[model samples]
Structure formats: structure tokens, C-alpha cells
Target chain A: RGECKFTVXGRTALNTXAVQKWHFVLXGYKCEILA
Target chain B: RGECKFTVXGRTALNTXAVQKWHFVLXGYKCEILA
Candidate 1:
């Protein structure tokens, strides 16, 4: 498809390899700076 | 550096070429069917 997006919203990854990271999905690179 | 979640909520892509795809952030692939 075209520019599809997956809005990332999750909780803490306890007991897993995933660390405490923030998932901020932006519209684009420019939008990235906005947040 | 901690766990952060960005619940991205926006309007339609009127000008963009992106298709209508619903994005759901999950922990794993199996979690995909939970929704």
C-alpha cells in the first residue's frame, strides 16, 4: 500500500527484553520535531 | 529514557496516497488477533 501508519500505544515491557522506551509515532520527520 | 506511549490520533489523509489501514500497537504478533 501507500504510506500506511501504525499508531504505537503500549505499556511497560516487564520481564521482557524490551526496555523502558517511548513509542512516539509521528506523521513524518517534521512532525517528529513537533512532539 | 523511560517507557513512553504516543497515542497518535489524527484525521484522514486527504492529500496523501496512504490507504485506510487501522494501526494497533501490540506487544507481539499473536496479540494481533486479540483485537
Candidate 2:
């Protein structure tokens, strides 16, 4: 299994403006993100 | 803020048939993957 992480800013949520961390797969066509 | 994470396998590297973690941007066309 492979995985990665990154930081996002007010892109997938609301009611707040801050930086969040996202982890996801490295596939080119299929995957998901979590904050 | 928002973010996501996932797992990848035997895709970004060789001689390393293993699972790796990758974190990417939420954008559809701007990001990078590390394994």
C-alpha cells in the first residue's frame, strides 16, 4: 500500500479558513482525500 | 481548509514493490506524487 500527505487551504470545507492535511493514493485516475 | 490521503502500490517506483504514501493537492491539474 502507498500513501502521501499534503496541506490544503479552504478548498474542501467551509465555516473556517485554515490549513488542513490531506492523505491520498497515487493513482492517476482513482482516489480520494481526507481532511 | 481541506485535504485527503490514500495508499498506492507498485506504481511510482521500481525494485520497491511495496505500498507508499502520497499526499497531493485537491486541484485537478496541479500536484506531485512521492513514493
* Candidate maximizing DockQ: 2
Error of 1 at B25 (Å): 25
Q: What are the clashing pairs of model 1?
A: none
What total of clashing residue pairs does each candidate reach?
Answer: 0, 22
lDDT of 1 at A24: 39
- Residues B1-35, candidate 2, lDDT per residue (tens digit)? 12333345522322233544344445543244544
Against the true structure, whose TM-score is highest?
2
Off by over 4 Å in 1: A1-18, A30-35, B1-35
Residue B25 lDDT in model 1? 34
Please write out the lDDT profile of model 1 over residues B1-35, one tens digit for every residue: 23333345532222113322333433421111111
lDDT of residue B10 for candidate 1: 33
Residue B8's lDDT within candidate 2 is 53
TM-score of chain A of each: 0.24, 0.18
